Design a protein around this ligand. Structure first.
Ligand SMILES: Cc1cc(CCCCCCCOc2ccc(C3=NCCO3)cc2)on1
Ligand SMILES: Cc1cc(CCCCCCCOc2ccc(C3=NCCO3)cc2)on1
Lengths: 239, 194, 297, 40, 239, 297, 239, 40
C-alpha cells in the first residue's frame, strides 16, 4: 500500500502517482443484481469489456474565480460508446460508477478541490418558483456549472456536503481523486433518459494561486468515469 | 381468457369491435393494428376480466399474455408478427423498428391461435393505474401487429379474414390497493321504477 | 388445488429450437386458457417473488364495509286535525342493490355465502325554517328493529309493534358510536343468489315479476326515533353499511358494464355516448392503427 | 379470529386460505392438455 | 386421444370428427344427489335410459347478420319425451346437461361461433324498466334470439363472457362443440316450470362468409341436449 | 457493525513520546474522518459512561407525531340559484412537504421506509356574522376517505363517491377522540425518495416538471362533513398528524438551510440578511479574531 | 417430433407450422470460441440476449419471372440493432447464423424455392473482366438479385448447388425453411465491413403459378436471421 | 411491540436496535487506515 494506484478496467488503465486512497461510497463495491432482488424477468445483457471501461470527459480549466462543475450520471455517459448504445437500445439499466478526477499543478501552486458524489441530487434554482428545465438539468458529458457552490444549488450547505462520498484534491499532496459508487435507487433499475442517480461535483474550496511567476497558469481538470457491473433490460429500438 | 375491443373506432357497432380486419395486402411490411396497454384509461384492455378486476386495484405487477385467434377459411394461409415494445419512445410504425423489441412470428395452420407473453419489464416492483398513462409509473409499453409475408386465400375462399384478440394474466400477477372502480357510477338512490 | 402464498417464480432458460414442441401455439377452441409459460416463450432469467396474494382473496375483496342504505326522514309533529300518526320512522324492505358499487361487487359472483356485519350511522340536522335558531343537536335515542318476513310492520312512531319481544332490535344514540351487529347467513338455500333466472311464484300472471328470487325475501328494517316529537323540526339521515365475512363465492360472473336503472331487475338504458354506450362500451379512437396516447419526441 | 361472543359466526374475518385452483376455470377440459405439445 | 369423439348415452350416440375436446363446466361431472345433501325424504325416481339421452332441438340457419340464439334449460327439454313427462308429473328435479352444438361448413367458409353456458342467466331488456314477460323468457325448445349479443342481454359484456364454460366452433378446425354442465343451484332441487339453471347461448363472433361461389350458403346450427343423472321428487298429477 | 448500548468509555493514558506514531496528524484528503482518539491525543483518565443512546436512534428521531396537513373550510349552505353543489368537503392531494419542520426531517435522509400512523384532529367554530349567537358546538360526523391514484374524486358533499365500498374511510365525531389509523409502506419502490433527480414522465415537454417522482403519486384524502348543512354557518379546521414507524433510513443528506418556497420543488429565495442569507448562512461577527460572546471581567 | 417447430432466441420467437426439419450446416451447431483456438488476447464481449435474436429483413415479392435473391452475412445485419452496433464498435467478430425463410401460399398455388447457404461465395460477373464493385457486392439488408441463378453468379452450376447446406420450400408441403450455420472462416475472427462468410440465396426453381383464379397473387418472401454465439474483440470508435 | 391487530405493520414502534456502523460514513476507504500510523 502506498500513494500510487492503478485502475485497470477492460482496455482502459489509469495510473496515478500522487493519490490518497480509494473512496468506496458507503463502504460498498458495485455488484451485479441478484435473483432475490431482480424484478425484470427477461435476461439482462452484461457486456463486460465493451461497457465497463473508463470514458474520459471533456476538461474544464480551473480559474481563480471558478465556482465548480457537476456531471450527472449516467447522463454524462449516455451519449458515449457501448454504454450509451446499450442505454439507447434498452429501457432498464443498472451500473455503478468509478469516478477519477485529474488535476495537475506544480509544487509552487496552491488550491483545493472537493469532489463530492451527491446521490439523488435535485437541483433547486434560486429566486424563482419555476422548476429547472430539461435543458438546464440534462447536460450530458459537457457538464454543468454551479451558480451557488456555497449552497450546492440545492438550498443546502456546502459545509455539510461531507455526508456524501467525497475526495479532496489538495495540490500539496494530491493530483487525482477516486470515488467508487454502487447502485443508488429505491428500485433495482430505472430509465436513463429521465433520471440520474449520482451527481459528481467538483467545487474549488480554495482558489488556484501562484506566486509572481505562476499566476494565470492554465490548469485543466479531467473527469474519467467507468461504469461497473452494467446490466440492461428491455431491448427495443433506439430513442 | 377475455376478448378485448381492438376495433374501438367510431365505425364499429357492437361485436365488430371484438374482431379485427385482416386483409390480403398489395404491399409488404405494413402495420395491421396497434394495442395500447393502458388498463386505467379508455382502451381495448379495460373491458376485460383482467382489466375490470385490476381496475378495482391501484398497483399491479407481473407478466401478461395475449392470444390471437385466426378466423379465416381453412385454405387461407398467412404470416404475422406480433411485437411488444417496452416504453420510452414512440410507437413503431415500420417492421424495421418493431422487430427489435419483443416479438413472435405467427404462422397459420392447424393451431389457429398464437400466444405472446408481455413480460414484466419494469424498474419498480409495481405499476400504477394512473390517469396519466404517459407517466413512467403507469406506461406499460406498446403492442403492434405487422404482416410478415402476406395473407393468401384462394378464389373460392373469402379474401378478408378476421383476428380475435384476447388478454389474460399469468401465474406471477399481483394486485394491491383496491379502490372504488370508475367503471360504474350513480347519481341518486336506485328506485323501484324507471 | 395448491396453496399460493406468493406468486409463481421465474426460472432461467436457454435457446430452445426443438421439432414438435410449440408452446406458443394454442387451441383456444377447446375452451382452455393458453398455458404458454413466459419461461420458454421468451428468454428469461431467475426471479424470486416475495409478493403476497392475501389482498387478492375474496375474503379481502368483499369483506370490506360498504354503504347499502341511506334513508332521510323528517322528525317533527306530523299530527293534523285528525291524523293520530307521528310517522317519525322508516322501513327499508331489506335488499342490497340500491348502491351501485356494492351491487356490482355482489354481482361479480353468481353465488355468495357470508355472515354480514351491519353498522348504522345516524346524523342530525335542523330544517331551515323562517325563524330557526341552532345552538346544538339533541342526543336522541333511535331503535332499529329487524322485522322478518310475515311479521307485523309498525305504522307509526307510537305504534305497539316496537315492543321487540321477539324481533331483534338495537337502541343507540346520536352521540354514541355507530351501532354495530351481525346477521348470520340467513338464506333458506345454501347461498345467496345475485341472479335468479326464473319466477318467485307458481303463477303465470304478469304480476309475478321475472328475476325475483323466492329466497331474497330478506324482510324489513324498521328504524324509529324513540324520543317523541320536538317543538322544532329536525331531519335524521341514517346510513347502513354492510360488511361480508366468512365469504365463499361460486361461479364468477361477467362484470356489469352498464349503469343500473332500478333494483327490481338488471335492465339498462345505456349512456348516450361511449364509453359504456349501448353499441360502444369502450370509447372510440381514431383508427385501429393510431395510438391515442402516443409519446412523441 | 378471536370471537369474543358465543356464536361462531360473530367472529372476525376468517383465517386466510390461499388454496388456488385456477384450472377449473382455465383448463376445464376432460382430456388434460400437456404443455409444450400440440393440443389440437 | 384425438379430434374424434363419441358420446353414447342411452339409445343415443353422437359421433363427431372435427371436434376439439370436452369442456366440463368448472371441472366437474354431473352426479346423483348424495344423502348428506338431500332434502326431500321420499325416494326420487331415477329413469336412466328413458331420460338420460340426447334430444335434438330444431335447427337455426346461420346468417351473415345473425346476432345469436339462446336456449334455457331445462325449459328446452320440458316439453320433450320422458324428461318432459317426468318434469310435468313431479315437483322437484335435478339433472346435469351435456350440450352438443353442430355446425357444418366447407373448408372455403369462414366463421366463428362462441357457445357459452351462462348459469343463472337473468335476461335484462334494454330501454325499459319493465321486467321481461313470461312469454319472452320461457321459450321452450324453440329458443330465443339475442337483441344485444354484445351485451349478452344482461348489461354485461360479451368480451368478459369467458368466465362461463364455453366452446368455440371455428370453421377452420371445428364443426361441433361439447360442454358438460353439472347441477347449478343454491338448492338441491327446484321447480322446472318457474326457474332455469343454465342458458346455452350461441353467438356468432365472426360472420359466416364465402368467396365468390360460397355466399348465401344455407348452413344450419343444431343443438342436442342430453340430461344426465336426472332425479325427480314429489309425484303428482300433470300441470 | 457493533451494538452500542452506551457511548464509548475512556481509558487512562500516560506520557507518549514515540517516533513514527502521529495520532493527531490525519489525511482528510482520503475522505476519511479523523480517527484521533481523545485517550492518546491528550492526557486522560478512566471514565465509565452509562449514558444511553436510545433517543438518538432514527426510530426515535423520526417516530414522533408531526403535523403534515391543516385544511379549513366553510360548513354552510353553498347552494345558489342554480348550484346543486354543497361543497362541504376538501381534498388534500396527499403529500408531506407543506409543513417545514416535518419536511426538513424527511429530507435529512435520501431514502426512508416506514409505516405511518395518521391522526386526524377536527375543530369547529362559528363564523362571526352580523347576527350570530353561540351557546354550543354540534357533534358533527366527519368521513375521511383515502382515494388512491386513478380513482374517482368526489365533487360535492352529496356526491355518491362517498360509498367507500373499496376506498378505506373512517367516520368520527368532533367530541370523540381524534381519529387514528395506520398506512403501511405503500411505495411501488423499496423506499420513499425525498429527492428525485429526474422527470416522472417519458415526455420531453415543459409540462413534465423536474424533480417530480413517479413514485410519489400518493393519492388523495377526501374529507367531508357527513351531516348536511346547518341553518347557520360553521367553519371546520382539520389537522392531520403523521407518525413514522418501523423506519429504515438510507444515505443521509445535507441539512436544508434555506426556507422552502413551495412543495413542488426545492427552490429557494433566501432571506434578506444573515443568518440563512444567500451569501451568508451564519450571521456576521466583527472579525475572525473578535469573540461575539466574550466573558469580560 | 413433427412438422411444427418453435425457434425461441432472446426476445424473439418464431413459430412455424408447415415446416420440414432443421438443417444444421455440415452437422454442426454454432459455439463460442474455445481457448485453444483463440487468437486475440483481450476478452471478447458476449451480449447474449441483445444480439442473439431474430432480425427480420425486408421482404421480396415472388414473381413468375423472379430469378432469385441473395443476402450476404453479416452484411445484412451489420446495420441493425445491437449486432450492428457491436460490429461498428469492434474490429473482430465471430457468430453463427440461424436463417429462417417465410413464404406463404394457398394449397392451389404451385412453386418451389431452393434456399442455399453458400460459404465464401465469390460473385463472378459475366461478360466483363472487371471485378465486382463495392456497391454491387456489399448490399446490406436490402439484398441482391441474381443475374444468372442458373450459374449462381459464380460460373458454377445451380444443379450442383446441393453440396451447400440447403432447404426446399415446396408449396405443397412447406411454407418455411430453417438453416443453421456455424462459423465459416480459415481464421477464428475477421473484419465485417470487408468480408462475408455466408451467402443465403433463395432461387425459384419452379415458378409461382395458379389456376384461373390465383394468377398474379402477391406472395412475399421474408428472411429472418438470428446471430448465435456472437463474440466481438478490439473495442474502438465507430466507423 | 404488542400488535393487537392482525397486520404486523399495525404494531407499535419497532424493538430497539443499537447496531452502529459509522465506518461506512467515517472510513469509507478501500485500504483501512490504521490508527496511530501515517495515513498518507
Ligand atoms: C344477494 C343477496 C345477499 C343478501 C344478504 C342481505 C343481508 C344484508 C343486508 C343488510 C342487513 O340489514 C340489516 C340491518 C339491521 C339489522 C338489525 N337486526 C336487529 C336490529 O337491526 C338487520 C339487518 O341478500 N341477497
Ligand atoms: C417521501 C415520502 C414519504 C411519503 C409517505 C406519505 C404517507 C403519509 C402521508 C399522510 C397520510 O395521509 C392519510 C390520511 C388518512 C388516510 C386514511 N385512509 C383511510 C381513511 O383515511 C390515509 C392517508 O411519501 N413520500
Amino acid at each position: 500500500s502506498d500513494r500510487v494506484l492503478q485502475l485497470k478496467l477492460g482496455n482502459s488503465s489509469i495510473v496515478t502517482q500522487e493519490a490518497a486512497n480509494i473512496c468506496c461510497a458507503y463502504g460498498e463495491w458495485p455488484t451485479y443484481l441478484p435473483d432475490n432482488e431482480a424484478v425484470a424477468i427477461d435476461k439482462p445483457t452484461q457486456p463486460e469489456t465493451s461497457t465497463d471501461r473508463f470514458y474520459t470527459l471533456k476538461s474544464k480549466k480551473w480559474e481563480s474565480n471558478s465556482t465548480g462543475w457537476w456531471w450527472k450520471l449516467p447522463d454524462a455517459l449516455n451519449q458515449i460508446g457501448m454504454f450509451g448504445q446499450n442505454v439507447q437500445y434498452h429501457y432498464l439499466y443498472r451500473s455503478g460508477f468509478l469516478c477519477h478526477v485529474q488535476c495537475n499543478a506544480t509544487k509552487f501552486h496552491q488550491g483545493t478541490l472537493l469532489i463530492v458524489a451527491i446521490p439523488e441530487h435535485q437541483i433547486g434554482k434560486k429566486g424563482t418558483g419555476t422548476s429547472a428545465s430539461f435543458a438546464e438539468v440534462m447536460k450530458g458529458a459537457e457538464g454543468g456549472v454551479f451558480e451557488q457552490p456555497y449552497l450546492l444549488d440545492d438550498g443546502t450547505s456546502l459545509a455539510c456536503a461531507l455526508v456524501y462520498p467525497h475526495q479532496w484534491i489538495n495540490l500539496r499532496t494530491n493530483n487525482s481523486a477516486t470515488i467508487v459508487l454502487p447502485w443508488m435507487n429505491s428500485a433495482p433499475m430505472d430509465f436513463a433518459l429521465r433520471h440520474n442517480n449520482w451527481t459528481l461535483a467538483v467545487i474549488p474550496v480554495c482558489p488556484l494561486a501562484g506566486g509572481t511567476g505562476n499566476t494565470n497558469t492554465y490548469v485543466p481538470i479531467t473527469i474519467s468515469i467507468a461504469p461497473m457491473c452494467a446490466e440492461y433490460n428491455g431491448l427495443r429500438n433506439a430513442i | 381468457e377475455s376478448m378485448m375491443e381492438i376495433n374501438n373506432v367510431n365505425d364499429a357497432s357492437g361485436v365488430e369491435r371484438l374482431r379485427v380486419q385482416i386483409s390480403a395486402q398489395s404491399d409488404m411490411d405494413q402495420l395491421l393494428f396497434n394495442i395500447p396497454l393502458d388498463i386505467q384509461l379508455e382502451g381495448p384492455l379495460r373491458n376485460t376480466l383482467l382489466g375490470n378486476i385490476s381496475r378495482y386495484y391501484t398497483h399491479w405487477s407481473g407478466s401478461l399474455e395475449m392470444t390471437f385467434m385466426f378466423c379465416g377459411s381453412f385454405m387461407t394461409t398467412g404470416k404475422l408478427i406480433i411485437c411488444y415494445t417496452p416504453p420510452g419512445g414512440s410507437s413503431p410504425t415500420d417492421r424495421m423498428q418493431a422487430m427489435l423489441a419483443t416479438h413472435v412470428v405467427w404462422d397459420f395452420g392447424l393451431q389457429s391461435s398464437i400466444t405472446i407473453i408481455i413480460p414484466w419489464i419494469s424498474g419498480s416492483h409495481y405499476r400504477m393505474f394512473n390517469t396519466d398513462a404517459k407517466a413512467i409509473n403507469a406506461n406499460v409499453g406498446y403492442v403492434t401487429c405487422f404482416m410478415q409475408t402476406n395473407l393468401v386465400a384462394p378464389v373460392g375462399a373469402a379474401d378478408q379474414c378476421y383476428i380475435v384478440g384476447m388478454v389474460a394474466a399469468k401465474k406471477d400477477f399481483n394486485l394491491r390497493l383496491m379502490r372504488d372502480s370508475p367503471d360504474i357510477g350513480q347519481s341518486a338512490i336506485l328506485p323501484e321504477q324507471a | 388445488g395448491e396453496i399460493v402464498k406468493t406468486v409463481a417464480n421465474t426460472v432461467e432458460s436457454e435457446i430452445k429450437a426443438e421439432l414438435g414442441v410449440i408452446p406458443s401455439l394454442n387451441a383456444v377452441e377447446t375452451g382452455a386458457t393458453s398455458n404458454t409459460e413466459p419461461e420458454e416463450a421468451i428468454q428469461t432469467r431467475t426471479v424470486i417473488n416475495m409478493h403476497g396474494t392475501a389482498e387478492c382473496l375474496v375474503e379481502n375483496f368483499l369483506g370490506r364495509s360498504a354503504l347499502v342504505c341511506m334513508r332521510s326522514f323528517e322528525y317533527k309533529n306530523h299530527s293534523t286535525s285528525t291524523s293520530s300518526i307521528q310517522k317519525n320512522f322508516f322501513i327499508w324492505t331489506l335488499n342490497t342493490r340500491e348502491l351501485v358499487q356494492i351491487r356490482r361487487k355482489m354481482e361479480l359472483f353468481t353465488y355468495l355465502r357470508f355472515d354480514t356485519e351491519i353498522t348504522i350511522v345516524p346524523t342530525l340536522r335542523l330544517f331551515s325554517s323562517s325563524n330557526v335558531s341552532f345552538s346544538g343537536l339533541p342526543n336522541l335515542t333511535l331503535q332499529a328493529m329487524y322485522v322478518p318476513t310475515g311479521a307485523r310492520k309498525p305504522s307509526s312512531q307510537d305504534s305497539f309493534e316496537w315492543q321487540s319481544a321477539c324481533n331483534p332490535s338495537v337502541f343507540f344514540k346520536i352521540n354514541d358510536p355507530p351501532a354495530r351487529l351481525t346477521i348470520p347467513f340467513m338464506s333458506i338455500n345454501s347461498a345467496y343468489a345475485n341472479f335468479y333466472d326464473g319466477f318467485a311464484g307458481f303463477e303465470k300472471k304478469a304480476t309475478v315479476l321475472y328475476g325475483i328470487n323466492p329466497a331474497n325475501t330478506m324482510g324489513n328494517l324498521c328504524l324509529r326515533v324513540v324520543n317523541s316529537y320536538q317543538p322544532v323540526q329536525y331531519t335524521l339521515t341514517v346510513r347502513v353499511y354492510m360488511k361480508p365475512k366468512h365469504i365463499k363465492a361460486w361461479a364468477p360472473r361477467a362484470p356489469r358494464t352498464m349503469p343500473y336503472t332500478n333494483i327490481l331487475n338488471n335492465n339498462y338504458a345505456g349512456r348516450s355516448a361511449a364509453p359504456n354506450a349501448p353499441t360502444a362500451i369502450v370509447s372510440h379512437r381514431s383508427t385501429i392503427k393510431t395510438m391515442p396516447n402516443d409519446i412523441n419526441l | 379470529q378471536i370471537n369474543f361472543y358465543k356464536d361462531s359466526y360473530a367472529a372476525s374475518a376468517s383465517k386466510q386460505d390461499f388454496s388456488q385452483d385456477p384450472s377449473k376455470f382455465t383448463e376445464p377440459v376432460a382430456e388434460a392438455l400437456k404443455a409444450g405439445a400440440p393440443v389440437l
